[PDB]
Ligand binder design. Structure first.
Ligand SMILES: [Zn+2]
Lengths: 83, 130
């Protein structure tokens, strides 16, 4: 259900990224847990920088972040989203 | 002593856009003068309550907050500490940490802002190392 990227539809993953970007949690601990989860799921070498320290040119809206993840995984031999 | 009430004191220092960049270097970054102006004389039940107030004031400050991205702005608006760059993170410590320059163990002041610094996890661990 939330063990890997392949367990998430793209819409479900967008929900997760949106919650993080809006800091929509009841505590700092809850937000850190979600960001760590995101890092483990994406396997992207930038880690939390995708959310907080975007590369010049990158779209750091929740939708932008999802597309950066989707494109990186597609280009680097990784499995993609469920449906 | 971190859990006994105190009023915040001290002046802080002028800062610029590189304020949080300084948190990864030397003794860390100072508390900004503008923040000290807002928090001086307020009573806090604990140091954690003070920490929350620091980040809330950062969220509201037009010069300090402009140098955070939208997701980090959301974080500070909740009173959370913002996330540091990846290479300054250490394990589950991923956000800026408040540090006492003269240690509390040695009679350092808990709520005097001139005794407080903003650090990254990596720099905070290194300062305490010895
Ligand atoms: Zn310290």
């Amino acid at each position: 259900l939330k063990h890997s990227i392949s367990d998430y539809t793209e819409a479900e993953f967008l929900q997760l990224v949106t919650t993080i970007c809006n800091a929509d949690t009841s505590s700092e601990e809850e937000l850190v847990k979600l960001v760590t989860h995101f890092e483990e799921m994406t396997e992207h070498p930038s880690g939390s920088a995708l959310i907080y320290y975007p590369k010049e040119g990158d779209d750091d809206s929740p939708s932008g972040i999802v597309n950066t993840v989707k494109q990186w995984r597609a280009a680097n031999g990784k499995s993609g989203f469920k449906q | 002593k971190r859990n006994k009430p105190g009023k915040a004191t001290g002046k802080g220092k002028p800062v610029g856009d590189k304020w949080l960049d300084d948190a990864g270097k030397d003794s860390g970054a100072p508390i900004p003068d503008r923040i000290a102006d807002k928090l001086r004389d307020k009573e806090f039940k604990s140091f954690d309550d003070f920490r929350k107030a620091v980040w809330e004031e950062v969220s509201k400050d037009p010069e300090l907050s402009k140098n955070l991205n939208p997701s980090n702005k959301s974080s500070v608006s909740k009173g959370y500490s913002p996330f540091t760059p990846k290479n300054q993170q250490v394990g589950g410590r991923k956000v800026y940490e408040l540090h006492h320059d003269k240690p509390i163990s040695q009679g350092g002041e808990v709520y005097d802002m001139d005794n407080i610094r903003v650090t990254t996890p990596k720099r905070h661990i290194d300062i305490h190392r010895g």
